[PDB]
């Protein structure tokens with residue numbers, strides 16, 4: 001998160017930090033006590049599937065107060081259509097070994113109805129992304145949770161305003177861009193998997209997932225987000241269906 | 255020459271002649287070049303979420319209706335959601 | 351379906367109609383309007399017109415810069431096709447009414463030109479309200495600087 005404020009403690013309670021072997025990995029979003037949405041490609045290089053750890057309630061990485069809750073990740077689920085090392089279908093669903101406990105510092109983000117998201121939410125101009133990622137492309141990561149407020153664009157406005165670059169990814173139906181072009185503010189490498197959250201009439205909803213861009217706050221580019229609207233049926237089907245055995249699982253999509 | 259003589263305006267708003275043109279002041283409940291739109295009718299979902307707090311279902315030839323997300327129930331005004339639990343999604347307790 | 355083109359603000363004395371091309375053959379239009387940093391409000395839902403009145407929207411805060419866009423949908427029915435109006439700041443760009451109360455209505459009443467321009471408003475050469483042919487002027491403006499001459503009186 002380049003350009004943001006520090007998120008005052010407890011004010012981004014759906015934020016999740018994923019760890020492997022106690023090393024920083026990605027962010028995630030609590031949509032449920034048992035369930036965390038992340039970015040698929042966070043798992044591109046994963047060799048140690050038993051040691052995936054999810055941490056809710058976290059704020060400051062260096063010092064541990066009483067609010068952080070740790071849980072083992074039981075299953076990571078990826079869309080069938082996701083291809084490792086590409087940016088399409090960039091989303092992950094994670095079941096935690098055991099539930100977290102909702103408190104003033106751990107709360108799930110509402111996962112909205114798909115049509116509500118398409119017709120109403122998509123047209124709230126500013127939403128919040130957040131995470132412990134880099135504070136500048138190639139720079140340090142964050143110790144306290146960071147948060148940034150960003151304007152969404154419709155894909156045509158995005159293509160028009162973006163600078164054509166040889167062999168860049170295609171902005172798809174399963175993405176959107178958000179943010180700025182004056183090279184001042186964006187999400188960044190630490191942040192993949194974390195919330196793009198939309199306030200509407202007193203309730204925060206999950207509309208996006210930090211996914212990819214051309215470096216971070218590059219002049220002439222925006223940040224791309226997984227378009228969370230497209231997977232609402234798929235996620236729901238998964239949270240209600242009965243557990244499959246495997247640790248990684250590629251679910252059919254749609 | 256005055257254009258308003260042609261009685262262009264509708265729904266009882268006054269006209270005012272302009273050059274090669276005119277204007278139409280409407281009453282509050284109406285808009286349009288000639289005040290021909292009733293604002294009341296569009297109690298539909300794409301119109302500002304139907305006035306619902308969270309969710310909206312249109313129907314056929316009948317008033318829309320509003321709904322609440324899991325962990326919320328609907329109030330007696332038929333537009334508002336209230337939490338039915340301690341920690342409903344999408345709310346932040348240290349500001350609530 | 352084809353995307354709207356050549357969109358324009360028609361604005362006089364604050365009454366603002368957005369106009370576009372073409373006439374819909376088997377397709378409908380929806381319009382959206384916003385301030386530069388505000389949420390997108392929708393109007394004129396699935397009309398077959400080439401116009402949308404947006405007096406009530408723009409009038410709520412005349413000093414904002416507005417942006418409009420128009421959406422195409424095949425009749426009878428992953429973003430819809432649309433195209434953008436140019437930027438419209440009412441206070442600076444609205445054409446001035448050939449002089450004898452504007453469209454801005456605070457509290458059920460159309461404010462007068464002076465209720466809206468205060469000191470920014472002169473005439474032709476008087477800061478006050480006084481063969482004769484008067485034009486109204488705003489010193490400050492880049493564009494649409496002055497109304498046409500009132501009807502002559504002797």
Ligand SMILES: *[C@@H]1O[C@H](CO)[C@@H](O)[C@H](O)[C@H]1O
Pocket residue numbers: 257258259260261262263
């Ligand atoms: C006279 O009335 C017609 C229709 O009401 C209008 O279109 C003209 O512009 C006006 O002069």
Ligand SMILES: *[C@@H]1O[C@@H](C)[C@@H](O)[C@@H](O)[C@@H]1O
Pocket residue numbers: 266267268269279280281
């Ligand atoms: C012109 O003003 C508008 C508001 C209407 O009240 C008309 O009756 C009047 O003549």
Ligand SMILES: [Ca+2]
Pocket residue numbers: 058059060061062063064065068
């Ligand atoms: Ca800590």
Ligand SMILES: [Ca+2]
Pocket residue numbers: 255256257271272273274275276
């Ligand atoms: Ca005339």
Ligand SMILES: [Cl-]
Pocket residue numbers: 070071072096097098
């Ligand atoms: Cl556990």
